[PDB]
Amino acid sequence: GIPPSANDLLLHVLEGVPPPGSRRLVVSGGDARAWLSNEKMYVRTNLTILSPGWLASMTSADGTHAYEMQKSPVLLVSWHGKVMQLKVEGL
Amino acid sequence: GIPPSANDLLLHVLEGVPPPGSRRLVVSGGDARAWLSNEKMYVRTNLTILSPGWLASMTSADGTHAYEMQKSPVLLVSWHGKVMQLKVEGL
Amino acid sequence: KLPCRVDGACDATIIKMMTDLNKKGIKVASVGQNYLISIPASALFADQSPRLNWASYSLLNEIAAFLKQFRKIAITVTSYSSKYVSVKRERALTLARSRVVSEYLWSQGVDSRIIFTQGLGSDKPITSYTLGGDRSPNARVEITFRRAV
Amino acid sequence: KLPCRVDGACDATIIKMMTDLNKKGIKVASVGQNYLISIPASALFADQSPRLNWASYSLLNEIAAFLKQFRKIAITVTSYSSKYVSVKRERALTLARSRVVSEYLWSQGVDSRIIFTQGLGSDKPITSYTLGGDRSPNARVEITFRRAV
Amino acid sequence: CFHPPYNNFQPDRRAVKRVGVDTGGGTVGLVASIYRDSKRKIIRDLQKQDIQYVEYGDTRTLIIPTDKYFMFSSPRLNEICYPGLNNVIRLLNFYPQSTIYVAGFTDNVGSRSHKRKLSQAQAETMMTFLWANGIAAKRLKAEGYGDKNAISDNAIIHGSAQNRRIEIQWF
Amino acid sequence: KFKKPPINNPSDDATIKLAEAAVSVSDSMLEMAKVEKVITPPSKDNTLTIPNAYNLQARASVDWSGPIEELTARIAKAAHFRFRVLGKSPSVPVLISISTKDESLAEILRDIDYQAGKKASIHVYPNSQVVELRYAKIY
Amino acid sequence: TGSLAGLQKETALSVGAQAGLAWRAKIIDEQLNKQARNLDAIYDFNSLVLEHNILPPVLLEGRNTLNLADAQSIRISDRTYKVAKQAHFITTPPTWRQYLWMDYVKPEAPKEIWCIYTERGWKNGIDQANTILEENIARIKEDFGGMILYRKLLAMNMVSPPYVSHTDLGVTGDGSEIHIDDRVLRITALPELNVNSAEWRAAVAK
Amino acid sequence: GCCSKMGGINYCDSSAGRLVCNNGFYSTCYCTRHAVMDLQFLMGCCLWHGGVYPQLNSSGLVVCNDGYVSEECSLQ
Amino acid sequence: GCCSKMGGINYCDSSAGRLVCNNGFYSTCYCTRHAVMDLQFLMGCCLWHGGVYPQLNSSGLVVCNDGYVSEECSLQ
């Protein structure tokens, strides 16, 4: 069987609109937004995610990244060649 | 029938990872580690076990030995031509 | 529980070291978000040799303590000298001087990602009065960067 | 319930006995983990004969009490002498001296596995001044070992 | 006075400053000078820094740690530890006729060619520093061994730390 | 007084265990590198693809732990060369890790090109003053 | 008890161990954060990934194996090789923080013989934290060594590489949603050991 | 005092997450949570897993969302 | 006093299980349990068997794990 193409919620995540029925999460330490809908995290950012591993990904025209991944209270990012961490609350 | 070749837990014992579901034992008097999984001790050391007798044995590339044997509160080892004893607690 | 500022930095401390360096004689300039530090070569090196004096390490420590106050990605260190014998010798001299200065700056704890070193010799003078040697105002070392966010 | 140190050994005792042996004149040297004890032959044997004096057993007891403070596997005992008659007589004398010294040391309670004995004659001198007999500094016995763990 | 970077490779006039400052006694300053210029005071000062001195027969040996007297994993000389190097020069000034051997030693971490090259580079750097202070080039020879003949155990931390060294022997 | 030369700062058992693991990792890598060099002898060097020129001899100390394009663009901008990109960038980013001290920009570009591997390549044209990064024809 | 002439509290350990474990975990976390770049240089998982972003499998090696199954019969082997984990697609490389980082939560939930048992529990918690860190180091060392041994046996021609098939479609979709260039990548054969010893190729290093 | 030895705080620029002083200099203080901080030390257990699974336990064991058991948060 | 007549204790080398003094000399004291000790006398009964079998007896008999009966720990 052919695998599924993508998840179409990532277009709304790229545009910045939260998916319906989801709840907000608090992100500290950097410029990113996160939502939780079906025990999965949807992240809109422009940094590079290194450690935790994501399931699906899309990119916009101006360089914005949208990720679908599993829930985790920490993220590892690369900012400008420097590795740092982002804190996720509300899980 | 053909006898079994080995036990595959001794590769993890050689690497140093304890077998799953086991419990730790305290070893005093020398450089050795022990675990208890199925009423059998698994011992990781680089000494030579002399008295109690073992059931299975493996050896790594750098000279580390892995033993499978029955439980016993005392081990007799040879260090550099000298015979001494190791104490096993937590049985 | 979150931090309230960048660690080990204060605006009053930044103003204090800027005023102290400008009163000492090292030129500190800021236009927009670009920062420039201009140092005469006589306060750091010997007479047209790439050998640091022992007393200039205090000035280098002060410059490093000023440089730890900001957040940055790239530093540029450029060396300029005067005409002594030929062009090859002065480019080699300026490259060696920039290498030594950037080596001590990287040995100290500046939190930058890239430090670029170049020596331009005597190609770009800032003063038409070229009578001195290392005492001339157009023999210098320049440290330029941009403050990030 | 477990022991806290190796039995019968103390660092203050080790320092005191090294200092006492160095003040008496027996050379004790330590580089890294290797230990060397150098004894002149005049303090142990008679005039170019493999017969111990009766008073040297106290010095041998002190050397054994020093040797019991460490943990070790192998000890090397080497003998060196001067030029008297012939090289065969030199080698036989040095081998007999090393055999007697190591026999008394093994009779005493040193906890070592192997003790090696050799006598090299007069092949390797340590001093170019070779005018004496057994009073020469290059007529000696050497005890070398390595501390284990 | 004294210039901290090697005093411009000049013989230091150490005694005249002390006997000039201890006058406002000349005999007291001379006694202090002849005490502090002695060989045993130099040996005890070198024992106050981390440099070992071994005398056995007519052969003398200095042991110098690269971990404190060199930069990390480089043949560059650590300039902060200059009193030890000056005391090595002061001790070696007492024997103007002997020949000098300098040998470099490292630990067991790395490749064989890397260990040999690092030991050879550190030996050449130490030999050049000895040559630049007045010792003639025909009295010096440098050699860098790897982990060939160590003095401690390389399977333990402190024993492996004691193996990285520079050996200076003379007659 | 009896003393031995190396007397350093006190150590931690966590660092001791990490060093004990790292020595075995290091000599395992040494053995496999020796075996791989024995099996496959290389024949070509990237000096032909990336040659040196004037104003590529300015030096740099770099500690970078991110993607390749920004670092290569900064190196080209410091070297006063134009920057060109060929091919589609992959969805999984090509990550590099550089930690050097005081070496030339040609050696920096050669190290980046070697660590890129089968995903990207670096070419330098000095007559037109162009640094070009090309992506592999994969996916 | 001895000679014939000779014949003729627990809560302190529990409150000490919980403090000592957290304190030792915090110090271990600081020591790990001090050496962050050297750990990244040592455990370089990114430089071992294969062509199509596939993590290499983990292989385990044993030498000089003996088994006494029962009386009258034994089985011996010279060498053994085992596949512990299998290759799969990844999006991100692993890091040492998923292996070595220890968990720290600050506990704010709290005399003749109290102090000695409190300090005994204080030693016990530190010993427990050291044991946990040792097990984590052993786990990450086993994983990295297996990924090294896979490349060694691939150089010595004892494993097969994984094989990847890609299918390219054009412009797919209906009138309400389109995809311009679609590619489906699927690995069809996993790495495996081969028992044909005639095709093994040796290595002699000068 | 954020803008000390300056003219005082002008406003919080939320595009960069920084305060602006009454001169043209950016301040070192943060004024939003979405500012670039060099965070290297974070607390809590079941980190680098899914987090703490919210069941209430009769024993003192703490289980993460991926089936792992946190021995540091687990009570002896 | 472990490093007596020396400069005092520097640190515990756990690779050898020994203390290091403030000079370059190894100490004679142990600081880990995984240190080489010449243990020759060990206490407890059912030694050189499988150990004491943990059943509770109406009598004072002590039985080892291999079926042997230890007469020394057995009550008369």
mmCIF file with all atom_site columns, C-alpha atoms in Angstrom, chain D residues 59-142:
data_model
loop_
_atom_site.group_PDB
_atom_site.id
_atom_site.type_symbol
_atom_site.label_atom_id
_atom_site.label_alt_id
_atom_site.label_comp_id
_atom_site.label_asym_id
_atom_site.label_entity_id
_atom_site.label_seq_id
_atom_site.pdbx_PDB_ins_code
_atom_site.Cartn_x
_atom_site.Cartn_y
_atom_site.Cartn_z
_atom_site.occupancy
_atom_site.B_iso_or_equiv
_atom_site.pdbx_formal_charge
_atom_site.auth_seq_id
_atom_site.auth_comp_id
_atom_site.auth_asym_id
_atom_site.auth_atom_id
_atom_site.pdbx_PDB_model_num
ATOM 1  C CA . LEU D 1 59  ? 70.465 -3.593  57.940 1.00 0.00 ? 59  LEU D CA 1
ATOM 2  C CA . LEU D 1 60  ? 68.913 -6.521  56.053 1.00 0.00 ? 60  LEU D CA 1
ATOM 3  C CA . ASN D 1 61  ? 66.079 -6.589  58.616 1.00 0.00 ? 61  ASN D CA 1
ATOM 4  C CA . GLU D 1 62  ? 65.528 -2.850  58.076 1.00 0.00 ? 62  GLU D CA 1
ATOM 5  C CA . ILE D 1 63  ? 65.453 -3.390  54.293 1.00 0.00 ? 63  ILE D CA 1
ATOM 6  C CA . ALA D 1 64  ? 62.939 -6.238  54.715 1.00 0.00 ? 64  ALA D CA 1
ATOM 7  C CA . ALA D 1 65  ? 60.777 -4.084  57.012 1.00 0.00 ? 65  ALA D CA 1
ATOM 8  C CA . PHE D 1 66  ? 60.827 -1.395  54.321 1.00 0.00 ? 66  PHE D CA 1
ATOM 9  C CA . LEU D 1 67  ? 59.929 -3.951  51.635 1.00 0.00 ? 67  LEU D CA 1
ATOM 10 C CA . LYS D 1 68  ? 56.915 -5.293  53.570 1.00 0.00 ? 68  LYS D CA 1
ATOM 11 C CA . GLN D 1 69  ? 55.138 -1.916  53.226 1.00 0.00 ? 69  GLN D CA 1
ATOM 12 C CA . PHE D 1 70  ? 54.303 -2.312  49.513 1.00 0.00 ? 70  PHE D CA 1
ATOM 13 C CA . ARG D 1 71  ? 52.417 -4.679  47.218 1.00 0.00 ? 71  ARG D CA 1
ATOM 14 C CA . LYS D 1 72  ? 54.442 -6.150  44.383 1.00 0.00 ? 72  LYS D CA 1
ATOM 15 C CA . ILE D 1 73  ? 54.866 -9.074  41.994 1.00 0.00 ? 73  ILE D CA 1
ATOM 16 C CA . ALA D 1 74  ? 58.557 -9.258  41.048 1.00 0.00 ? 74  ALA D CA 1
ATOM 17 C CA . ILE D 1 75  ? 61.790 -8.086  42.678 1.00 0.00 ? 75  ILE D CA 1
ATOM 18 C CA . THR D 1 76  ? 65.128 -7.859  40.852 1.00 0.00 ? 76  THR D CA 1
ATOM 19 C CA . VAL D 1 77  ? 68.443 -8.167  42.715 1.00 0.00 ? 77  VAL D CA 1
ATOM 20 C CA . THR D 1 78  ? 71.577 -7.311  40.736 1.00 0.00 ? 78  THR D CA 1
ATOM 21 C CA . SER D 1 79  ? 75.192 -7.311  41.908 1.00 0.00 ? 79  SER D CA 1
ATOM 22 C CA . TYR D 1 80  ? 78.167 -5.304  40.611 1.00 0.00 ? 80  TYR D CA 1
ATOM 23 C CA . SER D 1 81  ? 81.827 -5.506  41.661 1.00 0.00 ? 81  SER D CA 1
ATOM 24 C CA . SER D 1 82  ? 85.284 -4.239  40.653 1.00 0.00 ? 82  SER D CA 1
ATOM 25 C CA . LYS D 1 83  ? 88.345 -5.606  38.829 1.00 0.00 ? 83  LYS D CA 1
ATOM 26 C CA . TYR D 1 84  ? 90.335 -8.099  40.916 1.00 0.00 ? 84  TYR D CA 1
ATOM 27 C CA . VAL D 1 85  ? 91.608 -11.151 38.986 1.00 0.00 ? 85  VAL D CA 1
ATOM 28 C CA . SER D 1 86  ? 89.366 -12.207 36.101 1.00 0.00 ? 86  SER D CA 1
ATOM 29 C CA . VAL D 1 87  ? 85.866 -11.716 34.721 1.00 0.00 ? 87  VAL D CA 1
ATOM 30 C CA . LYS D 1 88  ? 84.780 -15.282 35.580 1.00 0.00 ? 88  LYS D CA 1
ATOM 31 C CA . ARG D 1 89  ? 85.762 -14.705 39.221 1.00 0.00 ? 89  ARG D CA 1
ATOM 32 C CA . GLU D 1 90  ? 83.917 -11.352 39.126 1.00 0.00 ? 90  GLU D CA 1
ATOM 33 C CA . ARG D 1 91  ? 80.731 -12.942 37.762 1.00 0.00 ? 91  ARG D CA 1
ATOM 34 C CA . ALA D 1 92  ? 80.850 -15.860 40.216 1.00 0.00 ? 92  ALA D CA 1
ATOM 35 C CA . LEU D 1 93  ? 81.392 -13.475 43.156 1.00 0.00 ? 93  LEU D CA 1
ATOM 36 C CA . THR D 1 94  ? 78.499 -11.223 42.125 1.00 0.00 ? 94  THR D CA 1
ATOM 37 C CA . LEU D 1 95  ? 76.153 -14.179 41.534 1.00 0.00 ? 95  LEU D CA 1
ATOM 38 C CA . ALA D 1 96  ? 77.026 -15.657 44.950 1.00 0.00 ? 96  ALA D CA 1
ATOM 39 C CA . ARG D 1 97  ? 76.465 -12.286 46.666 1.00 0.00 ? 97  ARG D CA 1
ATOM 40 C CA . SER D 1 98  ? 73.074 -11.828 44.972 1.00 0.00 ? 98  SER D CA 1
ATOM 41 C CA . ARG D 1 99  ? 72.089 -15.412 45.865 1.00 0.00 ? 99  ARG D CA 1
ATOM 42 C CA . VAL D 1 100 ? 72.927 -14.906 49.560 1.00 0.00 ? 100 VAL D CA 1
ATOM 43 C CA . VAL D 1 101 ? 71.140 -11.524 49.773 1.00 0.00 ? 101 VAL D CA 1
ATOM 44 C CA . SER D 1 102 ? 68.009 -12.827 48.048 1.00 0.00 ? 102 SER D CA 1
ATOM 45 C CA . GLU D 1 103 ? 68.056 -16.008 50.154 1.00 0.00 ? 103 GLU D CA 1
ATOM 46 C CA . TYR D 1 104 ? 67.905 -13.963 53.357 1.00 0.00 ? 104 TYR D CA 1
ATOM 47 C CA . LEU D 1 105 ? 65.273 -11.640 51.849 1.00 0.00 ? 105 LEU D CA 1
ATOM 48 C CA . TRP D 1 106 ? 63.101 -14.603 50.803 1.00 0.00 ? 106 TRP D CA 1
ATOM 49 C CA . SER D 1 107 ? 63.603 -16.178 54.243 1.00 0.00 ? 107 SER D CA 1
ATOM 50 C CA . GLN D 1 108 ? 62.171 -12.977 55.676 1.00 0.00 ? 108 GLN D CA 1
ATOM 51 C CA . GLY D 1 109 ? 58.509 -12.356 54.992 1.00 0.00 ? 109 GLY D CA 1
ATOM 52 C CA . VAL D 1 110 ? 58.292 -10.240 51.843 1.00 0.00 ? 110 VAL D CA 1
ATOM 53 C CA . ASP D 1 111 ? 55.030 -10.839 49.975 1.00 0.00 ? 111 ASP D CA 1
ATOM 54 C CA . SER D 1 112 ? 56.319 -11.068 46.416 1.00 0.00 ? 112 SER D CA 1
ATOM 55 C CA . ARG D 1 113 ? 55.734 -13.712 43.765 1.00 0.00 ? 113 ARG D CA 1
ATOM 56 C CA . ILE D 1 114 ? 59.083 -13.804 41.916 1.00 0.00 ? 114 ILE D CA 1
ATOM 57 C CA . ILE D 1 115 ? 62.577 -12.721 42.958 1.00 0.00 ? 115 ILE D CA 1
ATOM 58 C CA . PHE D 1 116 ? 65.206 -12.665 40.191 1.00 0.00 ? 116 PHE D CA 1
ATOM 59 C CA . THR D 1 117 ? 68.953 -12.739 40.919 1.00 0.00 ? 117 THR D CA 1
ATOM 60 C CA . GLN D 1 118 ? 71.774 -11.723 38.597 1.00 0.00 ? 118 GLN D CA 1
ATOM 61 C CA . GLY D 1 119 ? 75.387 -10.657 38.911 1.00 0.00 ? 119 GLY D CA 1
ATOM 62 C CA . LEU D 1 120 ? 76.826 -8.514  36.131 1.00 0.00 ? 120 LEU D CA 1
ATOM 63 C CA . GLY D 1 121 ? 80.451 -8.326  37.296 1.00 0.00 ? 121 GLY D CA 1
ATOM 64 C CA . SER D 1 122 ? 82.024 -4.985  36.361 1.00 0.00 ? 122 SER D CA 1
ATOM 65 C CA . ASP D 1 123 ? 80.280 -4.411  33.030 1.00 0.00 ? 123 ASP D CA 1
ATOM 66 C CA . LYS D 1 124 ? 78.283 -1.282  33.970 1.00 0.00 ? 124 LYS D CA 1
ATOM 67 C CA . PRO D 1 125 ? 80.029 1.200   36.289 1.00 0.00 ? 125 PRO D CA 1
ATOM 68 C CA . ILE D 1 126 ? 78.318 4.362   37.507 1.00 0.00 ? 126 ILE D CA 1
ATOM 69 C CA . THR D 1 127 ? 81.476 6.335   38.349 1.00 0.00 ? 127 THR D CA 1
ATOM 70 C CA . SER D 1 128 ? 84.680 6.802   36.337 1.00 0.00 ? 128 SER D CA 1
ATOM 71 C CA . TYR D 1 129 ? 86.766 6.999   39.550 1.00 0.00 ? 129 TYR D CA 1
ATOM 72 C CA . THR D 1 130 ? 87.814 3.348   39.830 1.00 0.00 ? 130 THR D CA 1
ATOM 73 C CA . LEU D 1 131 ? 90.705 3.417   42.313 1.00 0.00 ? 131 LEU D CA 1
ATOM 74 C CA . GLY D 1 132 ? 89.094 1.615   45.260 1.00 0.00 ? 132 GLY D CA 1
ATOM 75 C CA . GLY D 1 133 ? 88.291 -2.036  45.815 1.00 0.00 ? 133 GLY D CA 1
ATOM 76 C CA . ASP D 1 134 ? 85.071 -2.811  47.652 1.00 0.00 ? 134 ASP D CA 1
ATOM 77 C CA . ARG D 1 135 ? 85.232 0.783   48.941 1.00 0.00 ? 135 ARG D CA 1
ATOM 78 C CA . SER D 1 136 ? 84.643 2.032   45.386 1.00 0.00 ? 136 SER D CA 1
ATOM 79 C CA . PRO D 1 137 ? 81.148 3.496   44.797 1.00 0.00 ? 137 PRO D CA 1
ATOM 80 C CA . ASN D 1 138 ? 80.649 1.273   41.718 1.00 0.00 ? 138 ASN D CA 1
ATOM 81 C CA . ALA D 1 139 ? 80.733 -1.960  43.776 1.00 0.00 ? 139 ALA D CA 1
ATOM 82 C CA . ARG D 1 140 ? 77.176 -2.386  44.979 1.00 0.00 ? 140 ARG D CA 1
ATOM 83 C CA . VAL D 1 141 ? 73.962 -4.385  45.110 1.00 0.00 ? 141 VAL D CA 1
ATOM 84 C CA . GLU D 1 142 ? 70.719 -3.034  43.644 1.00 0.00 ? 142 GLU D CA 1
#
